[PDB]
Design a protein around this ligand. Structure first.
Ligand code: SF4
Ligand code: SF4
Ligand code: SF4
Lengths: 33, 232, 49, 50, 122, 98, 49, 33, 33, 232, 55, 232
């Protein structure tokens, strides 16, 4: 795995994780993020 | 401590245990469909798995996110199934994307399965040995030419609900037509546009005062015919 | 998939105050339970709007 | 003095010299569904604070 | 071949990820049956306090400066509130309550209470 | 088998609810969860809420404890007046926190 | 690890208004400094509760 | 490193990082996330 | 890629992505995170 | 610019520099404990490192997250230590998980260490060359059969504090018993339940008005015995 | 209506239960937290000896 | 559907298509600069690319994040350019870091480029074939010895704007001096400190009432000289 192409993929997956986690924290109990 | 039999706890503590199969059931009766029984595996004779006398057809299906937790969001499982040959697609265009259906999941040790599934028979078969869970379908998250994914939710899920619910209104009825609170049982009178009809399939209340008067139900009107002027 | 809505408009007839208008779809309430929302119709001053 | 209905009715003082009497008719809305009712009776209706 | 299960030191500094060295897991990449990155919920679940893991910790209404220093709750009301688009309420046992005024009408009363005998003035 | 006035249970319950006025906060929560008209009874409904858990909870909440003024008092009580429409999670969390 | 709590209940004796009851653990206040919270006892109308 | 097994692990680490950061931002200065 | 060194790098990339995302959600439409 | 000596500045700019050792001290005196001195390394003679005449015992320990920043959250460092042989465990069960302790870090160039640590001696030893930092322990984040992790914090950390703090109350005293504001110094009178006692170990104020009256201290009562009726 | 408030002033007499007392830092014209309030009948006379009820 | 010609539509549907070149233009005229034209590539003759008679110089430049969406945040593209030899640096120290400039991006199929760019000439050269987009520079995110990065934004971007904007004030004027609302056109009178001056370059209203009186413009005063007492 080359560093250049892997780091951007990791960053984009992390941003998608932030999407999903904020949206799921706006649910009932959660934290409202 | 789940109400699970002593044989299951005997099998759980063994060093070398049998395979733990999971059988899924999709129940769309309450939404207008049938009950489908699925298992990810066949049996040793290449046939759908027979459990408690019911045949669970072979179909790729598996779930994740199953947990029991109280602190935080209500747990939302996820069930992934195969959409090859357009089966789920057919149900999605038919049963409003299966939304509102009931998913029942059974965990059963293969040791306790019916003797039919095995060539030599199962002297240890015990159809009472199972662990059951129920969930609802909240959203068909994905549906492609390859597979489908469903988000499950606990049947309680107090997400969009509010309390108290009944709302004060003027010139509108909050009751359900012909419901217990409405209390109406008379013949067809008019539709939702206050047009006089004698057809039972076109008989709905307009929810306005005139609609109530058409059925002589004004005493049961759900609105409050004074509050419009006190709020000025 | 919401089925009941409470729209807050401003009545110019009774008095220029906020009136709530309830819109329901009883056919869908028999299907997706009953999901209710509140909306503020921005420029509405007529019950029809 | 009842459950599901009540009448109250403490009497009005007889007037001295004619005159009209203004009346304040209100209807409140409390709770939902069947309720037990007043704790005591007419002693549990605080008109202003009494 | 193992369960890794990331703890709290591994996530806080590359300190004990090299402690177990994850050699078998890393060289084996993983498998379908066994899941990695379990992320034990010890510290995260207890951040708000232990008492939050046992009770949901009911909230309190927003403080309004308009009230001088009066403290309001979410389960009492001694005021006659407006009764349009406002939900009726719910009362659960005892309590002294306000109301949602459905009607209010100041008019002229009519002489007499009941029976037959009526005297306008004495 | 529960008499709300004396707050004393007779014996085994076997279900079969009864329409009586009580201050038991557990059954106030039960009414909040499973009332079709104004509560959460249309969604959810009965057989989804563990009634025996609420039964034991109510028995616990009815125990006598020192009042602090020399007398005795039930452990936990109702007398809420919910007037503002909050989310069902909020009311449920308040009931389960009391 | 909180050591002081202010609970908001409603007094039915003085008047049906919000009274604040302070609960402290002086032994713990000598250990973890002093951490204070505010709580709303949902159904409380009795000082003991 | 195979892509299938690596992407799920990276996604789960991203979700955990989002949890940790959101909870960190609810501190004094932070951003309240 | 060794597991020890890679997991911390992924975690830090995830934290940075969460930072960027929480900051970009407080923009006009966004969700205010 | 930190108050650091000129020898350290001379050593920082050198191309080939000596090793920079970090010495840790755990001070639990203010929470009821002793002082433990630790270093991740031994010296060339296989002995605990002698710095300024104090022996820092060998023990695996290292910290991270140390920074000086003002914008944003207050920096929370972390300190990871070895919990083999159950040492930290023994302290955690003893000293309320070390919560409230003081962690002191010292950065010292090995060039300036005492001559004891070296076989040939250190003619360049200068015990005044060190960089000191203090932190508090906030939470023992992890404690397993292998290691332990602690979340340090700055001693200020205005997280749970409020301002102003004193609160107006009726029928309760907000003063500290026998404190300066309370100003009480009399003999034992009663316990927190207003029961009369002559025992000095069972003498605590009930914080109610009667408890104040028991000690004839009603002038110093921290409450306000009129505000209950004005709030109605 | 359109009045703008700050976090460092108050000109009203606020309720003094569960409210924290306050804090004032130099000068300023201040409101207060009413600790007591009692309307009663005053007693004639101010000091000394001589008192006249009416004249 | 974008206003794009039919030749581009024909080229998009072909299996084997020519290269799609992107030409960038930086326009700082509205902020006090010139117009620069860039393309990531040269042409077959080693010369800057000639499009529509304009020469776009060779320079490493590439954009990303270009999308058309309505739901959520307004899309913020990004443009990465080479900062070798300190060219962008020179702009940043000169044009306030290029903030407020206009970036125009053109997509052109190479088949439609001018015949100059090719040794054999272009029969299909059609200078009307292009797809244009405009953006603004919001922040020079990075500027190192190697490269520079710019954040782009849509020209609307209602981020810091409020509505309504005009504010009610006393003892201050919200109008723009010598603007249409101010309506002043007289000679130089005073500066922002109400000091009498006859110099046109030192003529600026103090925005107070006295400054307005200096120009006999009190009728056009933007403030409201009564509201200070009604707000008490
Ligand atoms: S308006 Fe009258 S008839 Fe119509 S639904 Fe309401 S109560 Fe029933
Ligand atoms: S009540 Fe009186 S004696 Fe007790 S702590 Fe307060 S001031 Fe001291
Ligand atoms: S104060 Fe008068 S002269 Fe000055 S800008 Fe305003 S309107 Fe123009």
């Amino acid at each position: 795995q080359i560093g250049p192409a892997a780091l951007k993929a990791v960053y984009d997956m992390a941003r998608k994780g932030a999407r999903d986690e904020i949206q799921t924290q706006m649910r009932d109990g959660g934290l409202f993020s | 401590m789940q109400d699970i039999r002593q044989e299951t706890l005997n099998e759980c503590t063994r060093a070398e245990q049998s395979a733990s199969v999971v059988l899924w059931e999709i129940d769309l009766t309450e939404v207008g469909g049938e009950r489908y029984f699925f298992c990810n595996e066949q049996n040793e004779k290449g046939e759908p798995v027979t459990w408690q006398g019911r045949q669970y057809q072979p179909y790729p299906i598996q779930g994740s996110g199953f947990e029991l937790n109280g602190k935080g969001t209500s747990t939302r499982p996820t069930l992934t199934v195969s959409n090859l040959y357009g089966m789920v697609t057919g149900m999605a265009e038919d049963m409003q994307s299966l939304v509102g259906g009931t998913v029942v999941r059974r965990k059963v040790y293969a040791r306790f399965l019916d003797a039919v599934n095995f060539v030599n028979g199962n002297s240890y078969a015990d159809p009472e040995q199972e662990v059951i869970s129920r969930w609802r379908i909240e959203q068909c998250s994905e549906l492609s030419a390859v597979s489908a994914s469903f988000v499950l939710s606990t049947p309680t899920e107090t997400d969009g609900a509010v309390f108290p619910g009944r709302i004060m209104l003027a010139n509108t009825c909050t009751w359900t037509y012909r419901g217990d609170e409405c209390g109406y049982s008379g013949p067809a009178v008019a539709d939702e546009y206050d047009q006089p009809t004698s057809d039972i399939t076109k008989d709905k209340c307009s929810k306005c005062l005139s609609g109530c008067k058409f059925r002589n139900n004004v005493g049961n009107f759900g609105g409050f015919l004074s509050i419009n002027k006190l709020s000025q | 998939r919401h089925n009941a809505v409470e729209v807050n408009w401003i009545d110019p007839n009774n008095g220029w105050e906020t009136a709530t208008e309830l819109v329901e779809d009883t056919q869908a309430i028999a299907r997706y339970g009953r999901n209710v929302t509140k909306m503020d119709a921005f420029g509405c001053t007529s019950r029809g709007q | 003095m009842g459950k599901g209905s009540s009448k109250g009715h403490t009497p009005r003082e007889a007037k001295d010299n004619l005159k009209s009497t203004q009346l304040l008719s209100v209807i409140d809305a409390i709770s939902e569904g069947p309720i037990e009712g007043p704790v005591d009776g007419l002693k549990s209706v605080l008109l202003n604070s009494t | 071949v193992f369960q890794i299960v990331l703890g709290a030191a591994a996530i806080a500094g590359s300190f004990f990820t090299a402690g177990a060295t994850l050699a078998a897991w890393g060289a084996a990449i993983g498998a379908g049956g066994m899941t990695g990155i379990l992320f034990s919920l010890g510290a995260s679940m207890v951040l708000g306090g232990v008492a939050q893991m046992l009770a949901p910790k009911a909230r309190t209404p927003r403080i309004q400066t308009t009230d001088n220093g009066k403290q309001n709750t979410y389960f009492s009301s001694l005021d006659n509130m407006v009764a349009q688009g406002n939900v009726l309420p719910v009362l659960y046992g005892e309590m002294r309550v306000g109301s949602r005024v459905v009607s209010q009408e100041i008019s002229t009363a009519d002489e007499g209470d009941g029976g037959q005998v009526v005297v306008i003035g004495r | 088998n529960y008499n709300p006035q004396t707050r004393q249970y007779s014996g085994i319950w076997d279900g079969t609810f009864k329409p009586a006025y009580s201050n038991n906060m557990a059954w106030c929560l039960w009414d909040m969860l499973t009332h079709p008209r104004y509560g959460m009874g249309k969604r959810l409904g009965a057989a989804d809420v563990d009634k025996w858990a609420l039964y034991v909870i109510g028995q616990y909440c009815d125990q006598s404890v020192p009042d602090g003024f020399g007398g005795t008092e039930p452990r936990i009580t109702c007398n809420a007046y919910l007037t503002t429409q909050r989310k069902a999670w909020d009311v449920l969390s308040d009931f389960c926190s009391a």
